[PDB]
Amino acid sequence: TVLLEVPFSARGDRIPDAVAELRTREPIRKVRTITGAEAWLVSSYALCTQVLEDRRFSMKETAAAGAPRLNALTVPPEVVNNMGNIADAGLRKAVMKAITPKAPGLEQFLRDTANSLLDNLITEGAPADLRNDFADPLATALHCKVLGIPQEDGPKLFRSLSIAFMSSADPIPAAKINWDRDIEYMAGILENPNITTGLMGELSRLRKDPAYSHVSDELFATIGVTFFGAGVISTGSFLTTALISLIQRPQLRNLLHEKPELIPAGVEELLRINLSFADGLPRLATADIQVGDVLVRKGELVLVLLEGANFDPEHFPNPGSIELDRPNPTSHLAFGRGQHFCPGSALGRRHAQIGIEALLKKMPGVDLAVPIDQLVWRTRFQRRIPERLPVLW
Numbered sequence: 001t002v003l004l005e006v007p008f009s010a011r012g013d014r015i016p017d018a019v020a021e022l023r024t025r026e027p028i029r030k031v032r033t034i035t036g037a038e039a040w041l042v043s044s045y046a047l048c049t050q051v052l053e054d055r056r057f058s059m060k061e062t063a064a065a066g067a068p069r070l071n072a073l074t075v076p077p078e079v080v081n082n083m084g085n086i087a088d089a090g091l092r093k094a095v096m097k098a099i100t101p102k103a104p105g106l107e108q109f110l111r112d113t114a115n116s117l118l119d120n121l122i123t124e125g126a127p128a129d130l131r132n133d134f135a136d137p138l139a140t141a142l143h144c145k146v147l148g149i150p151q152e153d154g155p156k157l158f159r160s161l162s163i164a165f166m167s168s169a170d171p172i173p174a175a176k177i178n179w180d181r182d183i184e185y186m187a188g189i190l191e192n193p194n195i196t197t198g199l200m201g202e203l204s205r206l207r208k209d210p211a212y213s214h215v216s217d218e219l220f221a222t223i224g225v226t227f228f229g230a231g232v233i234s235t236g237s238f239l240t241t242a243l244i245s246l247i248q249r250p251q252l253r254n255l256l257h258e259k260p261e262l263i264p265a266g267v268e269e270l271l272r273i274n275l276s277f278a279d280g281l282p283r284l285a286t287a288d289i290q291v292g293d294v295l296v297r298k299g300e301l302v303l304v305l306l307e308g309a310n311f312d313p314e315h316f317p318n319p320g321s322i323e324l325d326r327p328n329p330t331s332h333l334a335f336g337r338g339q340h341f342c343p344g345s346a347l348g349r350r351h352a353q354i355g356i357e358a359l360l361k362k363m364p365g366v367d368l369a370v371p372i373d374q375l376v377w378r379t380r381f382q383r384r385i386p387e388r389l390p391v392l393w
């Protein structure tokens, strides 16, 4: 028999019980990736946190030529260090202030968009597709408002993502075509005088500010492309698979409908058990570092399995159960940890909270319209998503 291969399953509605047996017997284990490279798979909360909290496990260095690779680069190699380049241009504070849910009228725009999408579904009649006709259009509309771009440009940018976020063994020619086209669009936004709000509106005025005169134009447009794609694919995928977990639990669904003030705690447990990230977080060791029973050598690839940490019984007792009263509710790794902690976590939380709350009010009796096995799980992709999520209510 051959070396164990990752990823285990494209399914995002159950964790394979091989994860628990691996975490107990071998919390750091040698695996093979889709490119044929070997990597260290880390599946325990203690070791995942160690790897994420140690910058000698470098994300930037995963882009080096000849390194062992989890998948093929779908971006220019310098875009792998996206947040490092943003921080070096002095734009980190401005970017993060622009993508908070605390902007005036942002939460109200979400609820109106969520209610409008659910009303169209109700009017068309069951069955409805909650991913393509709810969760994804909501994520797309939210990021258009956050970036400051017209809502009508959302759909054409969204359809690049099924290729842009592939997990491929080989480079993808269409990924570069979509990237170049989406960069040109974002560069025109920076030259568009009608774009004065959101992230692109702020970046536009900073581009003309003397303190940013020697920041490259490619970087301003890269921020727009990279934050739209990362945000749309992460919020849309998380909300899609969180709705499945809710629907599968009619008692939890009724409780959140009856007492909607528990929705923030519900979303935190849905984040912890979430399987949206299809691969471990890749890091390349830049030194010899002891991890558990393994001396990781310089130049080797490390994969941080988030569901291994988030389903760890040593840190979350009874990990498969949704418990709205845990003592450590936000200590999960759904947003990462350390240097590269997700910069849009607050906006991702409010997107799911508002989407769920609107769904429970409009379709309180929402349930699957097909047996759970009939869902089609997207393969070789950086997220686990069903192609369609058909429901009745």
Ligand code: HEM
Pocket: 059, 082, 083, 084, 099, 226, 227, 228, 230, 231, 232, 234, 235, 238, 239, 276, 281, 282, 333, 334, 335, 336, 337, 339, 340, 341, 342, 343, 344, 345, 347, 348, 349
């Ligand atoms: C439910 C929603 C989301 C989830 C579960 C999520 C998850 C994550 C995780 C786990 C990481 C860490 C990656 C690593 O350490 O290798 C990350 C990073 C990142 N996220 Fe999110 N994310 C979400 C929403 C968003 C949103 C709304 C945005 C922007 C609008 C965004 C933009 C980014 C960016 C740019 C990074 C790279 C950070 C860096 O390299 O320092 N994400 N995300």
Ligand SMILES: Oc1ccc(Nc2cc(-c3ccc(O)cc3)n[nH]2)cc1
Pocket: 074, 075, 079, 080, 082, 083, 157, 160, 161, 164, 165, 178, 179, 182, 225, 226, 227, 228, 229, 230
């Ligand atoms: O129209 C589009 C939209 C997305 C992409 N693909 C793509 C990769 C990333 C990314 C984000 C963050 C990061 O740290 C590293 C890569 N964003 N978008 C291409 C064309």
